[model samples]
Target chain A: MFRKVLFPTDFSEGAYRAVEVFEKRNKMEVGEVILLHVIDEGTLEELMELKDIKEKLKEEASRKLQEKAEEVKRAFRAKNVRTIIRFGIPWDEIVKVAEEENVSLIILPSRGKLSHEFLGSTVMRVLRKTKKPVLIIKEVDEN
Target chain B: MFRKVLFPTDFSEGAYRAVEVFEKRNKMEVGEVILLHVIDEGTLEELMDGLKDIKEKLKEEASRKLQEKAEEVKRAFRAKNVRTIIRFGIPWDEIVKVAEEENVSLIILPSRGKHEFLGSTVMRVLRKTKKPVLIIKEVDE
Candidate 1:
C-alpha cells in the first residue's frame, strides 16, 4: 500500500538501522526513496553565525545525504533515489515535505530516552499531524 | 493464513460499521467468524454475587452480544461457520491473549471505543504483540 516512502534521518545509527529494515526487505511498493534530513532551525540559529558557516553546514548535509543515498542504492539496488535538505522545525518540516512529495509512509526509530533512540515529542507530533503512516521502529537489543 | 477471525464488538455504531466492512470485503482466506464481547469487570461485579459466579454470567452475556454481532457480520458471507465468546478482564489484554491462544493472526478494532481508551492503547497492544492489528477509525459525519 505504501507507494512513496519518506525516510527521515537524524544521522544517528538508530535511524540508519531503521533504514536497513526497508533496504533488506525491499518492502516499499514504490521505487522512489525520498531521504530527508532536517536541520533544526532553533539549533541552527544557535550554532551558525557567519554566512560561510551556514553554507558549510548545507554542504556537509548535502554531502552526507549523497553518501547515504549511495549506500541505500547499493544496499537496496534501487535505481530511483532523491534527497532533500531543509531547515525548519523538525516535525513540521517532515510533514510538509511528505505532503509536498506525496509520500505514503514515513519511517523513523523510536526516540528512546535512556539510549536517545526513543521517540520523543517530534515523532508524536508527526503521527498526530500527518495522514501518512509513521513506522517507529524500536531498536532491538543485541546479545 | 487466517482461517477464522475473532471480532470483538461493543454494538456501537463503530462496531456496526466494522460489520459492514466485513460484509463487503471479499477475502478468500477468512473461513469462520468468532464474535466476542466481554462484560467489563465492573459490570460483571455489579451483576454477579462474587468472583465465582462471574464466569458463568460473563459467558451468558457475552454469548448474547456475540450472537447479535455474528448475525450482523455473517450477513454477506455464505460459509456460515461462526461462534461467540465472552469473558471478564481488561479488554485489550483479554482480546490479545485470546487471539494468541486461539492462534489467530489478525485483529480488527476501531481507532477508539466507548469503553477503552483511544488509539494509544491500541498502539501499546501493537507494540506488545506480533499480531497484525487493524484500527478502523470512525468517520466523522
Candidate 2:
C-alpha cells in the first residue's frame, strides 16, 4: 500500500502531461506527498554552466516544485507535502531522498528519449539501489 | 487512468507478489482484468529433441497455474471481468500484442525474477509498446 508517495518531476511538458493523465483515474490515498526536482547538475551541465546559472536554475526549480507540490496537495489532500530541489545526479538524488524520507512508494514516468521512451537509466539505477516499490508510467501515443 | 489492466505474469512468485502489492495499493477503478502468461516458446526452440511433447506439458502446466492465479486475483481484487490468456511466443511481443488486441488502457506487470535479472523482458516491453506500463517491482530487502 502507498501511504507516502514520492513523485520526482523533470519539469518537462511531458511530466505535466503524465500528471494530468494520472490524476484522471488514480484514487489512491496518499498520506504524504513529496515533490522532487533534481537540478540535474551533477550528471551534466555543471561544467559548461556557471554558478550564476545553477542558482538561476535552483530558484526556478524551487518555484516549479512548489507549483507541482500544490497540485499534488490539491489532488491527494496529503497531511504533509515536502518539495526538494537537489544538485545531484537524478538517480543518486532519488535514492537519497527515498531513504531519507522513508517513502512508501515512488511514482514516476519513464523518461522520454527523442521521440520514444525507454525505462531510462535513472529508474534502473534507483531499482538497483533499493527494494522500494515503484510505479512507472510510460509514454503513450493516442492517435 | 487504468480501467482495463493487462497483467502479464511469468508465474514467478514475484509476479504474484506484484499483483498483491498492486491491488492493495491500487485505487484504480479497474473494470476488467486480464491475466497473461507467456510460455517462453523461444526458449523451447533450442532443445528440439521432444518439442511437441515438452510444449504440451508446458501448456498443461500453464493452464493449471493460470486457473489458480485467476481465482486468486478475482478474490483478491474485486473485478467484474477477469480473463486468463496463454500465449506461446516471445514474452514481450505477446504482451504488447495483447495490450493492443484487447484494447487495454494500462499494462501492470512485475519485473523479472531476482535483482540480477532485472529489466530484460520488462525493458524490451517498455521500449516497443506505446501502452502505459506499471512495473510492480517485487524485491526482498
Candidate 3:
C-alpha cells in the first residue's frame, strides 16, 4: 500500500531496473511517483570552471528526468509523477527529498552505473540515515 | 513482484514487529514464506561435552519456536504456502543457505532498533546474499 514513492535514479540501467517491481506481478498501488536525479556536487564544482557547461549539464539533466518521469507514469499508470533535478550529494539529496515529499517508501538499486560489484555508497548512506522503508533491488545483468 | 520470501526470526519483539509488514500497508502477496530460526552451532558445541542431549534440546526448541511463528504468520498474513526451517549454524550463514535453497526472491527482516546500529546479521546478510532485502523498520511502540 505504498501510495507515494521516491525513486532516486543515477540514470543507470540498474537504477531504472528498480521500477520493475511496480511493473510486474503483485504490484502495489502507487498514487504518486517522485522521480529524482542528483547531479553530484563534485561534478558541479568541475562544471563551474566552465559557466556554459554547467548550464548545459543542468538542461540535459532536466530533459532526461522529464523523459524518465513520463516513462514511470506510463509504466505504473500513475497520474501524479513529478521530476526533480538537484545539484548536491546523491544520498543527502535523496534523503532530503524523501522527507520533503513524506513518501511511503524509497526504492533503490544496490549498484549504480559506476559501481562494478559493491552496493553504491549512496544507497548505503540513505539506508543508514533514513527512517523510511527502503526496498533495495540487487543489480541484475542486462545481458 | 516478490514471489518467494524468507523471514528469519529471533522471536524478539523486533522480529515479531516485522510480521506487521505482511499484515499492514504495502502488504506483499508472497507465493511462499520460508520461516526460519537458527540455533547457534557454536553454542551447541560448547554445551556438547557437558550435556549429551543438548543438540536434540536445541533442535526441539528451535522447531517449537518456528512452529509458533509460522502460526502467527498464517493468522496475520493468511499466507497459505508457509514452510518452516530450523538450522544449527551461524544465523546469517544459515539464513543465506536457506535463502539459496529455497530460491527466495526477497528477504524481510526487522531492524534491531537504532541502538544496535545497523545489526551485524543484517549487514552480513545484505552484503553476502544475492537476494534483495527489505529491512522493515521496527515500529516505535
Residue B137 of model 1, lDDT score: 37
lDDT of 1 by residue, B1-141 (tens): 224556777656766765554444333335566667756666556666534665776577667667755765665443357777775776677787777777654566654454223454455554554344444432212
Better of 2 and 3 by DockQ: 3
Clashes of 2: 0
Instruction: Report model 3's interface C-alpha RMSD after superposition on the true interface residues.
Output: 3.3
DockQ of each: 0.14, 0.42, 0.46
Stretches of model 2 off by over 4 angstroms after superposition: A24-31, A41-57, A72-81, A140-143, B20-30, B49-53, B77-81, B114-117, B139-141
lDDT of 2 by residue, A101-123 (tens): 77777777667346555556777
Measure candidate 1: CA RMSD: 6.4
Candidate 1: TM-score, chain B only:
0.70
lDDT of 2 by residue, B13-38 (tens): 77878777766655434567898899
Candidate maximizing DockQ: 3
Residues A1-143, candidate 1: write the lDDT tens digits. Answer: 23456778888766676566545434323456788888777886676246667678788998888888877655434547788998889899998997787665566555523553234667667766765545555433221
Error of 3 at A65 (Å): 1.0
Off by over 4 Å in 1: A23-30, A48-52, A73-79, A112-117, A140-143, B1-88, B91-118, B126-141
lDDT of 3: 0.73
